[PDB]
Amino acid sequence: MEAVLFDFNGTLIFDTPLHAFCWKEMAKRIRGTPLSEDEFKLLNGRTNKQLIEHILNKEISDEDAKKYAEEKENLYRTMLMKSDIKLCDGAINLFEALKKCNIPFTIATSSDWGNVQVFIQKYHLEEWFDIDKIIFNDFTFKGKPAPDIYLKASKKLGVSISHCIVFEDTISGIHSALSAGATPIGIASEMTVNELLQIKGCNLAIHTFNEITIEEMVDLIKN
Template sequence: MKKGGVIFDFNGTLFWDSEHQEKSWDEYLAAHNILLTKEQKKEYIHGRNGKDTLEILFKRELSDEEVHNYSEEKEVLYRNECLKHKMVLAPGALDLLNYLKANNIPMAIATASGKSNVDFFIDKFNLLDYFAEDHIVYNDGTVKGKPNPDLFDRAIERLGVDKAGSIIFEDSHSGIQAALNCKVGHVVIVNSTNSDYSSFELPIITHFDAFDRGVLKF
């Protein structure tokens, strides 16, 4: 078993898309006459998987077909919003990915996004140049969403690395809690939205160049 690996959340971490997410969610909620405060959106939506979020929003248990249809309705809005803008990875992300690849450091993505969005990201960012397809772990409906650590646990299992020696990059509060629940060696917060992370005693970066690569010498 390799000593450790690097696991990235995607939305808001490798891809700073928070404005696109907010706009598409606002449009979606308005279409369904659902009113949420900023705090409720942070708690109910960001970082969680689709089924959990939708059952909270619609206040009932949903069938798999309903979850798929409601989710895809929202994600079409999101992808259309993304396409209105230049899509680039987060500041310093490509340099770090190239460094990890050149040094044969195992890396994975663990995202609450569904398959349609993951396919979209793979195409737009050429993610398979850096990540094996099996190492892009997403919400396929079989794992609990964040703040449960299941997505990160699955990523670490697929990489075949030691959990205690691994690093997770996250941005959402529920995702950070999931990373802590995973009990990896290091959790790094990526602050892409000038958010308040005072409840966590963790390193915070606003550019991947600020990450201390000395931590990677497992």
Template sequence: MRKGGVIFDFNGTLFWDSPYQESSWDKYLQHYGISLTKAQKREYIHGRNGKDTFEILFGRKLSAVEIHQFTEEKEVLYRNECLKHKMELAPGAKLLLEELKANEVPMAIATASGKSNVDFFIDRFNLLEYFDAENIIYNDGSVKGKPHPEIFLKAMDSLGIAKEQTIIFEDSFSGIQSAINSKASTVIIVNSNDDEYLEFELPVINHFDEFDRNLLVY
């Protein structure tokens, strides 16, 4: 039987950046005269890939060039917002990553972020200390957006691990559903934004120290 592994979403999971995301999205939406409720943001934006989000926002099919343009406009605002603050991994995350690395547990990131943001995160958080570059799976324009499970399935394939031995950490509602749809053995909700997850019968943690290490396969 193949060794188990761990897959992390990034934004709102390993990096608690919701205030920066909200601020940058508010500026972006205001610029284009688009108004969304909190519920609409949760449904249309959080955890989804750029193509899905921008086609919903602008109400039409978009070319790859347009999607890239709209995405970069928004992500420049986001990265600038991040740089105004101290950027650090989520509470307890660094200790968990060090423990997983020491025990040679396969690890991957599966994020709806595009390459420019992923490169930014790799640089700011020294992610290659913990993750092999090929195991950082991001939105390259070809991956179906969450809640479709494709991004998590790609991460499992990259690590060479079975669904039955995979642990996924997620925070967004679309991401949680994506993880469930992937048939991973364990899905753990990271409550980085003080949300309520009553629709999911899943474990919820507020700090990575709360993660039950007994779930790991060493």
């Protein structure tokens, strides 16, 4: 095993309920009624543009989408900062154990810089991460499920993608890892362990990072 690539949202922090609240609040502001629980189950995982188009019930331009997406992300960042959402159980321990083993690791996220700034600020990520090797959406690559984000992360760490572990919490993110050639381990923050195992090419899923060891991860790659 040459590296570990961590997804952030839904993987290192369990922030999906907060995203749901922010989209429900945005729906209420824009259309006058929040998204129902059934609406959000249908929509969870779609792009910000698709969410706003659902709320307006109309296809819009990329530039329209960016403006309302930024309103939603401003609400999310503000709530996240004052929330007590912590890094997932066992994550910090894994971070320290990895450095002690001289195994490089970094974060890849679909989040734009606005959100990443909050992540670094709130979670003191410079304690464990070189901030310049955190991969985020800077609009220079295709998002998940495309492989681009994880090839970008492996190249930043100077390692071969096929000897990388990726921790991911969504269907599109698991398929980004698989398409890149990395070995994914699912984080059961929204899907169950068994639901993540039903994906072809996902052969281990866990609830928290307390449930994984360096040795389990090395063996998964060798297999």
